[PDB]
Amino acid sequence: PITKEEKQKVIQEFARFPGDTGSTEVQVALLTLRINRLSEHLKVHKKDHHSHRGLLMMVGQRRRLLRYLQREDPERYRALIEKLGIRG
Amino acid sequence: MRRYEVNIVLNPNLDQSQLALEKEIIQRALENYGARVEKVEELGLRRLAYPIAKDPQGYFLWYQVEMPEDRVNDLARELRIRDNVRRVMVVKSQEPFLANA
Amino acid sequence: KRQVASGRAYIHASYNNTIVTITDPDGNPITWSSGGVIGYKGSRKGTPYAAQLAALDAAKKAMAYGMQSVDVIVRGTGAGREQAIRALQASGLQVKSIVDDTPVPHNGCRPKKKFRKAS
Amino acid sequence: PSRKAKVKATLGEFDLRDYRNVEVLKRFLSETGKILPRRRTGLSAKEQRILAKTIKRARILGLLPFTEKLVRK
RNA sequence: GUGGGAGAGGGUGGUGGAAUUCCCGGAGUAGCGGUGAAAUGCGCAGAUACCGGGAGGAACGCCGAUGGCGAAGGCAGCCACCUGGUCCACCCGUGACGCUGAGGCGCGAAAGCGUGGGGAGCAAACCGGAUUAGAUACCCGGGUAGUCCACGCCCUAAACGAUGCGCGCUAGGUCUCUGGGUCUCCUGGGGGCCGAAGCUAACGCGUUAAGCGCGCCGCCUGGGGAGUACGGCCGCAAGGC
Ligand SMILES: [K+]
Ligand SMILES: [K+]
Ligand SMILES: [K+]
Ligand SMILES: [K+]
Ligand SMILES: [K+]
Ligand SMILES: [Mg+2]
Ligand SMILES: [Mg+2]
Ligand SMILES: [Mg+2]
Ligand SMILES: [Mg+2]
Ligand SMILES: [Mg+2]
Ligand SMILES: [Mg+2]
Ligand SMILES: [Mg+2]
Ligand SMILES: [Mg+2]
Ligand SMILES: [Mg+2]
Ligand SMILES: [Mg+2]
Ligand SMILES: [Mg+2]
Ligand SMILES: [Mg+2]
Ligand SMILES: [Mg+2]
Ligand SMILES: [Mg+2]
Ligand SMILES: [Mg+2]
Ligand SMILES: [Mg+2]
Ligand SMILES: [Mg+2]
Ligand SMILES: [Mg+2]
Ligand SMILES: [Mg+2]
Ligand SMILES: [Mg+2]
Ligand SMILES: [Mg+2]
Ligand SMILES: [Mg+2]
Ligand SMILES: [Mg+2]
Ligand SMILES: [Mg+2]
């Protein structure tokens, strides 16, 4: 699945200050985690459509948060996309 | 790493040398799949509700073990290879749900 | 020629006919009968009266092998299943057990249109 | 009707998740093999739903009948 | 974010019992089957009925619901693995990041197409038997495509709550599924039935609105001609928009 250790790792990684579980960065991170997991799961099991819908939703969330981040602080945005390697 | 329970129904006609053979085979197969035994309860030969392999009874052993999730299915398969093995049931361990409490 | 004296009686009841096999404790048939075994021909086979004299015919045929004690099994639900057990009741054969084995599946096979509205 | 005897009421405090326990599960079955309906099991939504699984489990292990012959009649 | 819940939500792989068919064997004899009544059909190369062994496909009885899950189509033996949504408690983090959504993209019952497997039961077409005035039908006996699997198409429907999505507000009662708490009771989340105010042509709807409002999308404008023609697009075709 995704173990709590993995999660806490990425959170501790992308936090803005210690204690931050909620910032845009953290969220986009956790999303990228789950999205990548699901893309891997759907490389096999290509016939599983409902999960696919899930991932469409996740992606849409992400692009939205990222679009907010760019609207807000372009520097943090650039930093993020470069860090996770997004935008495709 | 999760806790499962392995269910093994065995053939009742078994000689002790052959019985212990099947048991130590199960042992080696469990170890080889990275499973560690936690509790074991060998209940023995009991009358079934309907013939299995044309036999009116079966020999039961039960293993509550902790093993890597990813291997479990493979393990079950190994367990069923032997002819003396009749059923293999591997259940994900659960917490007892009571009534009249 | 056997001298069985104990054994089984399978009543198979349908809507179109009733038929009684009488067999040995291992289940191999000794004799049998049915609606058409006696005079009957058409629909009249699934009469309950037909099932009566069918069970009786079978019983008499069974006394010929010298049978006394018999366990009944009843498969099928139809007119004159009950009257067949009722004739058999004292046919002179004494009846030990009665059972219903009538086969029902777990929804395996797809029934005919006539038998449909189920699966 | 089914006002005669409720199964949970005629029994003690038992584990509902135990497929290995036979003699307890046995009392939730009928004359033939068939799992008893809620009204005669005196269970609840969740309870019934769990009994079903533990019973079917026990059936696969060969500890409970899938179906029985009916006596009398 | 943390800690938990329920579930036929999805994909993949295992596996269980019942039944039907077929094959092998045993016993057994004159029918079985079928209908309103019958006939065709099957049976002395021994059937039907009965017991034992085996093969193969398909579907999962009881639980089973007035139930649950899913955006819809839809989802039901058991077990494991992969995985989506969702609900509750704490009230910890971000700080309006929100709603809707023309076009695009994906999904999309059944039947249908292509290639290849599979084929037990059922069964369009077809072949027979009946009934009828006739009977291209209802009934009965056969039976091919098909139904099942993989991959690829097709894109439809009473695809129905015939009721677009989101949010705020406006009596209650009763049944019910599932969380949490001080656990007769209180408090969330879903499904029903009756009903305030109100709405409605009426039937009815009525905190699961068809009420009061705001945002956004889709659609309507007498019946027949006709979902036809012509044009375009998609499709292997059938055909679709
Ligand atoms: K969980
Ligand atoms: K329903
Ligand atoms: K054709
Ligand atoms: K419409
Ligand atoms: K055209
Ligand atoms: Mg008849
Ligand atoms: Mg008598
Ligand atoms: Mg969860
Ligand atoms: Mg499921
Ligand atoms: Mg002939
Ligand atoms: Mg012969
Ligand atoms: Mg075959
Ligand atoms: Mg539906
Ligand atoms: Mg806070
Ligand atoms: Mg602040
Ligand atoms: Mg389709
Ligand atoms: Mg189809
Ligand atoms: Mg095809
Ligand atoms: Mg063609
Ligand atoms: Mg047919
Ligand atoms: Mg026909
Ligand atoms: Mg409610
Ligand atoms: Mg009023
Ligand atoms: Mg109404
Ligand atoms: Mg009302
Ligand atoms: Mg006009
Ligand atoms: Mg006009
Ligand atoms: Mg059209
Ligand atoms: Mg063209």
Resolution in A: 3.6
Method: X-ray
Give residue A54's domain range. 1-88
* Residue D23 forms contact with B (CB below 8 Å): no
Class of domain C1-119 (CATH, top level): alpha beta
Whole-angstrom Cα distance, residue B7 to residue B63?
A: 7
Residues B66 and B3 sit within 8 Å (Cβ to Cβ): yes
Residues B3 and B65 sit within 8 Å (Cβ to Cβ): yes
Most distant CA atoms of chain D, gap in Å: 35
Strand E contact at CB of residue D2, distance < 7 A: no
Nearest partner of B31 among B55, B7, B66, judged by Cα: B66
CATH number, domain of D57, equals: 4.10.640.10
Instruction: Let me know the angle formed at the C-alpha of B60 by B54 and B65, rounded to the nearest 5 degrees.
Output: 135
Q: Could you give the residue ranges of the DSSP H alpha helices within chain C?
A: 48-63, 82-89
Whole-angstrom Cα distance, residue C107 to residue C87?
A: 34
Nearest by CB to residue B97, choosing from D15, D20, D60, is: D15
Contacts of D11 by beta carbon, 8 Å cutoff, 6+ apart: B100, D24, D27
Identity (one letter) of the amino acid at C34? S
Contacts of A48 by beta carbon, 8 Å cutoff, 6+ apart: A41, A42
Residues 27-86 of B with CB under 8 A from D: 46, 48-50, 52, 58, 60, 62
The domain tally of chain A equals 1
Strand E contact at CB of residue C61, distance < 7 A: no
Give residue D42's domain range. 1-73
* Residue D12 forms contact with B (CB below 8 Å): yes
End-to-end, the C-alpha distance of chain C in Å comes to: 46
CATH number, domain of B59, equals: 3.30.70.60
* Residue at token pair 């179109």: C16
**3-class state of residue C40 by DSSP:** coil
